QDP(DPR)K(2TL)(DAS)
Amino acid sequence: QDPXKXX
C-alpha cells in the first residue's frame, strides 16, 4: 500500500 516500499 505504499509505492516503491511495499504494501
